[PDB]
Amino acid sequence: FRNNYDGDTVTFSPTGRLFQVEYALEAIKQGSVTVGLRSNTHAVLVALKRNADELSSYQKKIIKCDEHMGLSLAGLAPDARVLSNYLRQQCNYSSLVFNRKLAVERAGHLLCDKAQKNTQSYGGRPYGVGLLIIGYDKSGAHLLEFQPSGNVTELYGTAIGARSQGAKTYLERTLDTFIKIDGNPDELIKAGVEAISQSLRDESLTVDNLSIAIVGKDTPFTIYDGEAVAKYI
Amino acid sequence: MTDRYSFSLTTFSPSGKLGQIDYALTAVKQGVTSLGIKATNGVVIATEKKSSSPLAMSETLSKVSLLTPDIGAVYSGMGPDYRVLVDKSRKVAHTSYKRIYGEYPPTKLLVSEVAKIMQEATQSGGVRPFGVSLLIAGHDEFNGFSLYQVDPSGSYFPWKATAIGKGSVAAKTFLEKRWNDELELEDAIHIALLTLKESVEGEFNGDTIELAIIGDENPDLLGYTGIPTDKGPRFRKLTSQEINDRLEAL
Amino acid sequence: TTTLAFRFQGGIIVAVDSRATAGNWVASQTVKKVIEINPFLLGTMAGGAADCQFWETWLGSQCRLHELREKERISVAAASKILSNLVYQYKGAGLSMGTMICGYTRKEGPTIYYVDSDGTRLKGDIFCVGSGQTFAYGVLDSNYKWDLSVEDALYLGKRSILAAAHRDAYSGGSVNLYHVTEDGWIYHGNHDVGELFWKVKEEEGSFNNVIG
Amino acid sequence: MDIILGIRVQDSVILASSKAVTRGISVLKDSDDKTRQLSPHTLMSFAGEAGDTVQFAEYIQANIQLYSIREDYELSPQAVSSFVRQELAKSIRSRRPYQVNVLIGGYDKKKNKPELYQIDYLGTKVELPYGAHGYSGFYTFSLLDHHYRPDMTTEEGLDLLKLCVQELEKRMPMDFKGVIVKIVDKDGIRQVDDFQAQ
Amino acid sequence: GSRRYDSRTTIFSPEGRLYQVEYALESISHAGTAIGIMASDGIVLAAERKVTSTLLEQDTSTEKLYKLNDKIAVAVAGLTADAEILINTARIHAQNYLKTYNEDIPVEILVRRLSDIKQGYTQHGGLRPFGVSFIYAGYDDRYGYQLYTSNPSGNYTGWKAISVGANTSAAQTLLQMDYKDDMKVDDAIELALKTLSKTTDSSALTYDRLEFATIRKGANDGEVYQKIFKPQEIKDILVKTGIT
Amino acid sequence: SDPSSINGGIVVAMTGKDCVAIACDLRLGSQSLGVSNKFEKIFHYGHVFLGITGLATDVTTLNEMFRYKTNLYKLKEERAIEPETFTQLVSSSLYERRFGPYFVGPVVAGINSKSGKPFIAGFDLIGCIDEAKDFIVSGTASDQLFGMCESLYEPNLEPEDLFETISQALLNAADRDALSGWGAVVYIIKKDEVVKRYLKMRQD
Amino acid sequence: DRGVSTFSPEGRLFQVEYSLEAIKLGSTAIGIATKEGVVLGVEKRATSPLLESDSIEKIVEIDRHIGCAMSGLTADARSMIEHARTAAVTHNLYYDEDINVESLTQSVCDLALRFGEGASGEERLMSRPFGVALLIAGHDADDGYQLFHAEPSGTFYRYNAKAIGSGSEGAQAELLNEWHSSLTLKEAELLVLKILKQVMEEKLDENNAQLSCITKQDGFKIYDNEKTAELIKELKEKEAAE
Amino acid sequence: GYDRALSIFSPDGHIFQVEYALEAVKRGTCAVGVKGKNCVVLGCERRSTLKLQDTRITPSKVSKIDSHVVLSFSGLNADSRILIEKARVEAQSHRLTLEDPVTVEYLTRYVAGVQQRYTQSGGVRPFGVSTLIAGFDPRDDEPKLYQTEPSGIYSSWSAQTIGRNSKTVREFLEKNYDRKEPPATVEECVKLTVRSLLEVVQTGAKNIEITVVKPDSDIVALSSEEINQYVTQIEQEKQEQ
Numbered sequence A: 001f002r003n004n005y006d007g008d009t010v011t012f013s014p015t016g017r018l019f020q021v022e023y024a025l026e027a028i029k030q031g032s033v034t035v036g037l038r039s040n041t042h043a044v045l046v047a048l049k050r051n052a053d054e055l056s057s058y059q060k061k062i063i064k065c066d067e068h069m070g071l072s073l074a075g076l077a078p079d080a081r082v083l084s085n086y087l088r089q090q091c092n093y094s095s096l097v098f099n100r101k102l103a104v105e106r107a108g109h110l111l112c113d114k115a116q117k118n119t120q121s122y123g124g125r126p127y128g129v130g131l132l133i134i135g136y137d138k139s140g141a142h143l144l145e146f147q148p149s150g151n152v153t154e155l156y157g158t159a160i161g162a163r164s165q166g167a168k169t170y171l172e173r174t175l176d177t178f179i180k181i182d183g184n185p186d187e188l189i190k191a192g193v194e195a196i197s198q199s200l201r202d203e204s205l206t207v208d209n210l211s212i213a214i215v216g217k218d219t220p221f222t223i224y225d226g227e228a229v230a231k232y233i
Numbered sequence B: 001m002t003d004r005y006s007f008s009l010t011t012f013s014p015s016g017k018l019g020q021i022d023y024a025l026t027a028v029k030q031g032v033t034s035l036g037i038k039a040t041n042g043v044v045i046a047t048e049k050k051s052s053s054p055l056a057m058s059e060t061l062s063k064v065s066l067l068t069p070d071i072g073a074v075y076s077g078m079g080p081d082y083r084v085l086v087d088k089s090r091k092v093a094h095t096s097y098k099r100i101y102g103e104y105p106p107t108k109l110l111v112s113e114v115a116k117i118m119q120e121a122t123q124s125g126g127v128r129p130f131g132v133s134l135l136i137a138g139h140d141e142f143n144g145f146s147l148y149q150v151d152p153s154g155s156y157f158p159w160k161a162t163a164i165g166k167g168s169v170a171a172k173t174f175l176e177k178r179w180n181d182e183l184e185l186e187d188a189i190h191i192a193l194l195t196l197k198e199s200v201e202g203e204f205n206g207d208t209i210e211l212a213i214i215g216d217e218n219p220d221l222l223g224y225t226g227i228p229t230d231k232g233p234r235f236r237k238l239t240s241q242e243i244n245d246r247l248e249a250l
Numbered sequence C: 001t002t003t004l005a006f007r008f009q010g011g012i013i014v015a016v017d018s019r020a021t022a023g024n025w026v027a028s029q030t031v032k033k034v035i036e037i038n039p040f041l042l043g044t045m046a047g048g049a050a051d052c053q054f055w056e057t058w059l060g061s062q063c064r065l066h067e068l069r070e071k072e073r074i075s076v077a078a079a080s081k082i083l084s085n086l087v088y089q090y091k092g093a094g095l096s097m098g099t100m101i102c103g104y105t106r107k108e109g110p111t112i113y114y115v116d117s118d119g120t121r122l123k124g125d126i127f128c129v130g131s132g133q134t135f136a137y138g139v140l141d142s143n144y145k146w147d148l149s150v151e152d153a154l155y156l157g158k159r160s161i162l163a164a165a166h167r168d169a170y171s172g173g174s175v176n177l178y179h180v181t182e183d184g185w186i187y188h189g190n191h192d193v194g195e196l197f198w199k200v201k202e203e204e205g206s207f208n209n210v211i212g
Numbered sequence D: 001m002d003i004i005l006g007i008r009v010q011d012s013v014i015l016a017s018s019k020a021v022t023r024g025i026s027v028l029k030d031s032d033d034k035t036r037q038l039s040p041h042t043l044m045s046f047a048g049e050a051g052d053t054v055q056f057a058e059y060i061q062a063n064i065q066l067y068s069i070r071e072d073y074e075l076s077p078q079a080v081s082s083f084v085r086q087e088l089a090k091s092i093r094s095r096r097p098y099q100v101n102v103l104i105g106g107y108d109k110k111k112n113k114p115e116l117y118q119i120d121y122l123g124t125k126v127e128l129p130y131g132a133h134g135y136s137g138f139y140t141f142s143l144l145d146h147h148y149r150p151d152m153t154t155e156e157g158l159d160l161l162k163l164c165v166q167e168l169e170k171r172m173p174m175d176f177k178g179v180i181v182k183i184v185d186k187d188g189i190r191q192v193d194d195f196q197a198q
Numbered sequence E: 001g002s003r004r005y006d007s008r009t010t011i012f013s014p015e016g017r018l019y020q021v022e023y024a025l026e027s028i029s030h031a032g033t034a035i036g037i038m039a040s041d042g043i044v045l046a047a048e049r050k051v052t053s054t055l056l057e058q059d060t061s062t063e064k065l066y067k068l069n070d071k072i073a074v075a076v077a078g079l080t081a082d083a084e085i086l087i088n089t090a091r092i093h094a095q096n097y098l099k100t101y102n103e104d105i106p107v108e109i110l111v112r113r114l115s116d117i118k119q120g121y122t123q124h125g126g127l128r129p130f131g132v133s134f135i136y137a138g139y140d141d142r143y144g145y146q147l148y149t150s151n152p153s154g155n156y157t158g159w160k161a162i163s164v165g166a167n168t169s170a171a172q173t174l175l176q177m178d179y180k181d182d183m184k185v186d187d188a189i190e191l192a193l194k195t196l197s198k199t200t201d202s203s204a205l206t207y208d209r210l211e212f213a214t215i216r217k218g219a220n221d222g223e224v225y226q227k228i229f230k231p232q233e234i235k236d237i238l239v240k241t242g243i244t
Numbered sequence F: 001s002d003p004s005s006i007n008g009g010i011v012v013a014m015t016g017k018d019c020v021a022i023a024c025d026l027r028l029g030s031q032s033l034g035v036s037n038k039f040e041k042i043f044h045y046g047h048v049f050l051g052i053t054g055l056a057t058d059v060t061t062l063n064e065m066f067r068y069k070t071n072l073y074k075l076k077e078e079r080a081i082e083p084e085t086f087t088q089l090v091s092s093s094l095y096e097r098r099f100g101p102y103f104v105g106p107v108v109a110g111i112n113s114k115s116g117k118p119f120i121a122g123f124d125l126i127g128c129i130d131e132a133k134d135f136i137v138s139g140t141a142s143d144q145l146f147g148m149c150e151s152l153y154e155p156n157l158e159p160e161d162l163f164e165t166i167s168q169a170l171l172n173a174a175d176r177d178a179l180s181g182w183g184a185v186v187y188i189i190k191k192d193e194v195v196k197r198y199l200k201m202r203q204d
Numbered sequence G: 001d002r003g004v005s006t007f008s009p010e011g012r013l014f015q016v017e018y019s020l021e022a023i024k025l026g027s028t029a030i031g032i033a034t035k036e037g038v039v040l041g042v043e044k045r046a047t048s049p050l051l052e053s054d055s056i057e058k059i060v061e062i063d064r065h066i067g068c069a070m071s072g073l074t075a076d077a078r079s080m081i082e083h084a085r086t087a088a089v090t091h092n093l094y095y096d097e098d099i100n101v102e103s104l105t106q107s108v109c110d111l112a113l114r115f116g117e118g119a120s121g122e123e124r125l126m127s128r129p130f131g132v133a134l135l136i137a138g139h140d141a142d143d144g145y146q147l148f149h150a151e152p153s154g155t156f157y158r159y160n161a162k163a164i165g166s167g168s169e170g171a172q173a174e175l176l177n178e179w180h181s182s183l184t185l186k187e188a189e190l191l192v193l194k195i196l197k198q199v200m201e202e203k204l205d206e207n208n209a210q211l212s213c214i215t216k217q218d219g220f221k222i223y224d225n226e227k228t229a230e231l232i233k234e235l236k237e238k239e240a241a242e
Numbered sequence H: 001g002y003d004r005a006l007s008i009f010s011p012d013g014h015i016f017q018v019e020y021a022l023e024a025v026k027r028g029t030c031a032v033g034v035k036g037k038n039c040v041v042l043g044c045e046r047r048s049t050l051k052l053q054d055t056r057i058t059p060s061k062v063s064k065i066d067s068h069v070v071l072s073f074s075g076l077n078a079d080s081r082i083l084i085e086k087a088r089v090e091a092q093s094h095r096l097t098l099e100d101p102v103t104v105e106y107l108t109r110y111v112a113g114v115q116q117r118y119t120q121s122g123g124v125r126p127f128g129v130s131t132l133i134a135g136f137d138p139r140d141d142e143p144k145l146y147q148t149e150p151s152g153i154y155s156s157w158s159a160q161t162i163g164r165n166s167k168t169v170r171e172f173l174e175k176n177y178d179r180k181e182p183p184a185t186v187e188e189c190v191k192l193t194v195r196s197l198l199e200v201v202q203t204g205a206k207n208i209e210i211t212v213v214k215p216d217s218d219i220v221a222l223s224s225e226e227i228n229q230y231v232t233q234i235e236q237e238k239q240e241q
């Protein structure tokens, strides 16, 4: 079975499945956990940075795409770089040509389409990375979840990566609560850190291990790493 | 999209055979028989019009085609392949010769062109060889009359007389008995008709048989007068009636 | 513009004026006409400021890449030909440059190559480029000796630019001096022509025609 | 233009080329060697457009040296000149043609005879006893038409050229700063370092 | 995708051999035998016509001997059509050389170029090689008479006497047995016919099954002449050499 | 300026009884400066002759091109090219450069090897064929040649007679042209043999 | 067959993983980063005594402030080094400054996944991944001394110390216990020299091993044999001292 | 259009097409190079699968890339031609732009690059060739000897051999070549070279060619006799014991 239909993305299995895409999705699950949640004034990204050795650094998982948009990655870092770079250009184009900040919803659509082209043609490969996009645009705070399959969804919060299911159930429970944390970033962030720790097991979030990013009403998308996240550990 | 088949589909096997050429030749073997006979003053090529249905109009399908006013061709094997080979042949006769020297190419050279087209379908990426063998008859000032066979590999050889397709083995044998270097065109036509009769199962007449010759110039088939040096085509397809008249003297 | 470069016992002297003009307008009296390709190579600029500045800086980048690749100092012959060949690719497009590529390698010794936007590449001992060249050549030709001392050579160059700055409306401002040795070039100051003129006049007795 | 002269005597070809390089108002150099050795027994002199001149010469030189290595053989002077003519004949119909005129002097070791080829920038090639490019022919051809002999010695050829150069130095408006002379014979190419007063 | 159907005509075997080349050579080994013998005063090219009929027109035929230049010719062993493709490009290269240098192309230069083309189909492009082997007989004023050979691999070598096609082993042994450096064109012509005669897979060796050519420097002239023998000419020499 | 008036030169061909003649001057100059007195403008491929006037570099290039093409022709056709066919090859080769033509005035002369019929033809720089039965002129003195030919010429002249005529036509036309002269060569052509004669004329 | 950019059922790219296997077979390379500079050392590993060891160049200069060591199919690293030198020089031409070590590294890693037979994303013309990993070390004003490990996967990690090549699992374990935030350049040197000696099949000497470093003051320098030999001696002595 | 990845990684981390390329080199005739104190000598063996060749015209095993550098090889002959041509072209280009001929290491690094490139480009197989490149850098008298292989890897050797039975001859060289005292003579160097080949050529006066390269473009090939003479003097060294 599978073996005869998973040689490339241009092949459907007898049940209508695209294995190469599914295998790509697997690279995400093997990725370090990351969380995203928003209120009506802010959107927060909390990501667990993973390190190789105790002599290595904890690889960055948050990329800023514009002053009002950014994302967290889980899976192949190079693929996140490619996709985020495409997003940086799209945001940039919107500004230069229409003097308009790109709508988070529009960014989601563009990412979906870019990923889709790599699932219907021979020679290429699906992207092997998941992305959580947050941003504050003309319709408020936003959070998006991007899957290599090309499926992008808007949520109040979510998580991807290894053991992400913990944080996700926590948020699905804490919903009514954090969704109202308007005007108070530190509270939204703490809520995010509380959701992410729901997926810990190995260790505990340390200073050079925790990575946070926020964007909102009067807050340009900014990243906090190390000492700057201490007040949340 | 984009033809991504840039590699050969015909390659050498351990034994040294070129599979696809072989298979193409096999397709030719199953084809209806066709033959050609060279006389001292002309050449005749003929084949059977194997009408695939009585509702079909066998005249709307010519197995014998004019390539130039002094060269004609017939085949055995895959009809559609032949049809496009003829379009390409007629065109190459112009682009690679008439538009350069202001005259139609000599038989061997046009044959050489066709052969090249076929050889390429034996080595170019993404294609299969042509499933046909052609018999090309023509005349040119410095070579007189000639008859050539072109196979799927692109190889070609001159003949005094030969046959290809279904009953080629038997037909070639019968031709070896009747051929001599003093045959007149009518004699060749007669021999051609006899040879073709052994290969035809059903009806054998001017409506089931297709035959053409390369002979004298037909000024009546030129279409205009005024140029002394333009005397008309040497190629001429016989009419159903012309064939039957000769069948009575069979 | 007046730029010059000459070969002698102590290496190479490179002297240039520092005036920039667009028509009769003196755009600047403090322009750099010498490009420090790298610690061992100097380039002079005459004609189009942008063309020279741009391609001579680029030249440095190419020289550096060479040394990383060949783990060995680039030759003046090779550095000059890189610029020469680049410029030749653009022949007819309108580049405008009169240049001197100067260096002192172990293999070649003191070397100067004149390179212009016409694609011309000439090795030589003495070169002057610019609207003031003829003035500098007069001074240079009659006082040049291969056995000049570094001190005297530096002065000859400075004096020659002075001659040109005085007579050429398009030359002046100040004089920038350089000495090129196998171990690299040594900058030898910026000399305002205003002051330099009176000084030289008094100490030398020349420019008798000017009232001071 | 610069002075480009060539003469084919009994057993050698002699090329004389002006040493000046003038750019605008000034003579930038007076020791310029307007020549490139294409092979041990073939020399080419040239005159024309500022940058094209050397770029073409060196380009041809590169090609001949490459051929020599590939074949471990030295192309005949005639072969080299045809290659050069073709290069110029292509150039004349290109975007920006090489405005270069050349004289190719070579000693054919197989025929054991010197040969002189004149080719202008259009790819116009002709073989001659003596030739020139530009205005040079205007002042010197009457002298060469007079004193030339197929059996001249190299020494006689040098004396005839000296005469030509003197006529050029008398009637020509420009100071070309003398000429560099080179001999091409069965033994190769050598330069007459003493013509400043021969 | 397409990858599925790619034969990969240009890869090495675990032993470091080129599959397609080896198979093409295997193909060549069943082709009519062609022989080349170089003498002090000329060169001989002889070839056996594979497959023949009473009706085959031999006067208008040529399947093994082709003129490339006025001083160079080749004998073909393998796919005729593939040969013609190469022959034509060879004829063009000769002319390009002539136009460029105004001198006929040296024999080796033309042979190397053709072999280089063959070598290409061996390292890139994903196409089958040409199932052809050539014996080159030519003359130039640097090496005089020369005899070369090139096969599917794109490799070429020089010879005094050589053969390509079927039964080369047997043919080579016979040639290596009777060849002598001081041979003469007429001696060579006879050696060639004798060799083919003993290696033929056919009953007898008749004229209708042969193609013959010689490149001599006709004493009464001073130039090089190529003679592609005519049917009657072969028939003649066949009797004289005592094979009737 | 005018590519056809830089190097100078002329060519003329005539038909006679079972023969044809093609002649040309030997000059090659650079405007007023004479450069070569040995620049022949007649070439031949097999038994077909071609004279070319005009820009020297193109004359040389065209000859090399036709040598190249007639060689491949012989190799494939297995016979030498004929006058009529070559004329067509010249025409199509010139037209191929319709918008960047060779600045030449070609002239074809020869006898058909199979019909024995004499043949001459001229072309303009873009291939237009002129197939005259009498004579064809080309070059910087073509007006003068037309004058000479139209008067001196008469049909069916024998080889020895045609020689005198073609020569007088060439010689006197060249002497009224600043860019022609400095030597001349005439080709008398017959089915079997071809004789080439150099003429004696002024050298100014 | 199977595409060169196919995912395994585990979510890994076969070619990239198989690439890592080739790297394991390569000679050892170690890098140690200290506040006094970064040391880079490698195992020459000549294949025959007739091979002139000094012609083995597994440590190359990218720019005055960046050097790098390789391990694996070293021939595959030439175009990477070339791209690196060009990126650094180009950056300087465009900005009149030094390219940050991290930036230089990211540029090299951008080539990494540019392989395939027609991957829909741009024009990645390269038939396979690189079969060599690199240790990029350097210094810059914003982040001081740095050591990076660039893999054919395209990802790069910053390390305080790192070993790649045949003896990496072992050497890395060693580095884990030997590295501390206050190592001096000399301690690092001896340390690299020691670990190389432990994992090298051959007895480490100044001919089958080579050291180098990069310091803000003098930039990237490759230690000539004489200099290293002494450091070898100094190591033997400190070890025999207990 | 053809761009199939022919050279790819296998699970164990190998690139079989490059690996098999080496196998083609093992099958090639042996080649050896040894550097003296003031020269470098290149020796090659001559196959004998067929003998009746015309030695004058048959392509030789040592090729001049420029007047001061030569290249020999083991492997596919047709493949070596491609590398040689590119090397010769690159040699002239270098002289044209840098106004100085290539150093031996530069020329080597170039050939190796071409080889490496053919191991990771689509639609092409690696070169089934290994080379020995020797000569003297312009204005330098220190001998140079380098070796390249299909992978694109290269390095310099005091002496080295490639091709069939190179294993054998390398051993000979490893216990017959002292870096302390390299063949201080053109003669004793050529001898050591012939000796190493005799370990595998099995009596082949006409099966052994040698080329001597000295400083300043001084390159010359020995004749059968000159070599045959070395062989003779060598067989005696043995019998005289």
Ligand SMILES: *C(=O)[C@]1([C@@H](O)[C@@H]2C=CCCC2)NC(=O)[C@H](CCO)[C@]1(C)O
Pocket: C001, C002, C019, C020, C021, C022, C023, C031, C032, C033, C045, C046, C047, C048, C049, C052, C130, C131, C170, C171
């Ligand atoms: C001298 O060549 C020039 C200078 O303005 C530039 C300035 C900076 C570097 C290159 C030299 N160039 C000109 O075009 C000026 C004259 C315009 O008539 C001037 C001052 O001679």
